[PDB]
């Protein structure tokens, strides 16, 4: 269950959603699955919202067990999109839909691709086939106001603010990744090694991080460990049951230390009330000698092709 706002019980599918400037205003909008909704509006001929009553906490995730969504405060690729940290791309005809996930009835599903993040949307009164390749009409969606089970998030992903690295570091990580995965030739169509003869696209369960360069760093053996920062992004402001504080109220509550909050908030910021968001903190990869605070980190399924020797 959520971080700010309980699941939304929306009035009409034809109402539009405002662009808010507050941090907690957006964190709430993410709780009410408003962001996935806008995406579908902006992109797929969708009418209305998604996440009815259930909200963001009630979305379906590909691996049936899914550790990171158990912590309400880890950001998904869509949640990280809604705060500008990345872009969930519109699917291209070429973008490969991994098999495994239960696409039947889904109006939006998303997965990380090797060079970015790709999500899939459906139009009015439609939902995804069981293959994922087609939206056949589902009259159980014609209300336009769909529950959170119509939203699918593939992979066990976390997204966090990233201290960005010199490309020199990235080339050196990129190289090591090829050395642990010598056999893979192309991932999601992006050249990973250079190959003569390449196999058929196969399914691929993999660890990776987004370090913010040309593509992710897939890792076989590595070490992850979490540290809590108590930062300004780690605290949310609200009036209980009335929603989140406005942008002005928020900027003030955190800088003039004159609002309320929990012990962890007061310990660092002094004392609308703002408290610590439930997450283990921020993850720090340790891979092939180096330490990196990545943008996103996760265990997804992508489409890799292999070497024919």
């Amino acid at each position, epitope marked *: 269950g959520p971080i700010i706002c309980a699941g939304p019980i929306h009035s009409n599918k034809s109402a539009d959603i405002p662009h808010l400037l507050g941090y907690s205003e957006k964190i709430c909008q993410i709780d009410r699955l408003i962001h996935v909704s806008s995406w579908l509006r902006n992109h797929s001929q969708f009418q209305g919202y998604v996440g009815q009553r259930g909200g963001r906490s009630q979305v379906s995730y590909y691996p049936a067990e899914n550790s990171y969504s158990r912590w309400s405060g880890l950001l998904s690729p869509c949640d990280a999109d809604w705060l500008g940290m990345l872009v969930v791309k519109k699917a291209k005809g070429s973008d490969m839909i991994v098999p495994g996930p239960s696409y039947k009835g889904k109006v939006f599903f998303e997965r990380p691709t090797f060079d970015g993040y790709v999500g899939w949307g459906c139009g009015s009164g439609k939902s995804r086939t069981e293959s994922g390749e087609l939206c056949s009409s589902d009259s159980r969606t014609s209300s336009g106001l769909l529950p959170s089970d119509r939203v699918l998030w593939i992979g066990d992903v976390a997204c966090q603010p990233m*201290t960005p690295i*010199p490309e*020199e570091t990235f080339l050196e990580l990129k190289s090591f990744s090829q050395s642990e995965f010598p056999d893979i030739c192309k991932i999601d169509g992006i050249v990973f090694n250079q190959c003569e003869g390449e196999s058929l696209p196969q399914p691929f369960d993999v660890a990776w991080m987004d370090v913010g360069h040309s593509h992710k760093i897939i890792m076989r053996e590595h070490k992850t460990k979490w540290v809590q920062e108590s930062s300004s992004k780690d605290f949310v402001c609200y009036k209980e049951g009335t929603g989140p504080c406005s942008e002005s109220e928020e900027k003030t509550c955190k800088t003039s230390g004159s609002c309320r909050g929990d012990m962890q908030f007061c310990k660092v910021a002094g004392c609308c009330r703002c408290s610590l968001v439930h997450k283990p903190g921020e993850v720090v990869v340790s891979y092939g*000698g180096m*330490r990196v605070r990545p943008k996103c980190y996760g265990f997804s399924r992508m489409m890799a092709t292999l070497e024919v020797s």
Partner: antibody, heavy 125, light 107 residues
Framework: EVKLMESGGGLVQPGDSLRLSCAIS????????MSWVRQPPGKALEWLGF??????????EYSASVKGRFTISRDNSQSILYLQMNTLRAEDSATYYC????????????????WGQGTSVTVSS | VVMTQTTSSLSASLGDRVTISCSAS??????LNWYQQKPDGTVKLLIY???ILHSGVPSRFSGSGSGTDYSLTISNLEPEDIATYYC?????????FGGGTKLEIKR
């Protein structure tokens, strides 16, 4: 006392090749990456490429400006860094420095902390 | 990435504080170094990672900055400090240097 001394520049004709070299004093050569940097006359320092250390197994990287014509290489036995300049061209003429760079991966502190004196190359017809 | 040193030359008087300013075509997330070249041609490292002083550099030197804007500051121009000052970034692949800033004395 970390010392670098470039050598081998001169006046060569376009198309010619010419090899520059950089001699090392005062520090364990195989430990450090090394970069070649050139400074066209009446211009600013251009960075050209580098050769990693023994730890990262003597890999190289090259700026787009000269990829496929130049070649950095080291000779751990003699403590010498070489820049190999093939298919030279009028734009290549400049003075060429080599410099050892300091790397602190844990913090991403990468900087060229000791420099040669420069060797001058002029490519002209 | 394209670095710009705002002023090609920069006049000053011995003893007072001087500031050379470096501006980047895009945010370089503090991966910025400062070198000083003297007329003999010699080059030395001064500051790496925006503010960290290279070994054996005097304390009157300091640099600072963020995002796309960075600056080097000598607190007492001393005659040896008369030299061209080059900044250089390492967030993106082709390490790129500024255009320099040569220091002239006011009379």
């Amino acid at each position: 006392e970390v010392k670098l001394m470039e050598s081998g520049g001169g006046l060569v004709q376009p198309g010619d090749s010419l090899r520059l070299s950089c001699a090392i004093s005062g520090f364990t050569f195989s430990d450090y990456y090394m970069s070649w940097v050139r400074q066209p006359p009446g211009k600013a320092l251009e960075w050209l490429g580098f050769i990693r250390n023994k730890a990262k197994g003597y890999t190289t990287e090259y700026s787009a400006s000269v990829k496929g014509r130049f070649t950095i290489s080291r000779d751990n036995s003699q403590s010498i860094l070489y820049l190999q300049m093939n298919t030279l061209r009028a734009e290549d003429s400049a003075t060429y420095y080599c410099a050892r760079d300091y790397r602190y991966d844990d913090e991403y502190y990468y900087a060229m902390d000791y420099w040669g004196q420069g060797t001058s190359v002029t490519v002209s017809s | 990435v394209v670095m710009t040193q705002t002023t090609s030359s920069l006049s000053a008087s011995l003893g007072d504080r001087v500031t050379i300013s470096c501006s980047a075509s895009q945010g370089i997330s503090n991966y910025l170094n400062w070198y000083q070249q003297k007329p003999d041609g010699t080059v030395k490292l001064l500051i790496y990672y925006t503010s960290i002083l290279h070994s054996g550099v005097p304390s009157r030197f300091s640099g600072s900055g963020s995002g796309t804007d960075y600056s080097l500051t000598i607190s007492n121009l001393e005659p040896e400090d008369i030299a061209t000052y080059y900044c250089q970034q390492y967030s993106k692949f082709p390490r790129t240097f500024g255009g320099g800033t040569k220091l002239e004395i006011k009379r």
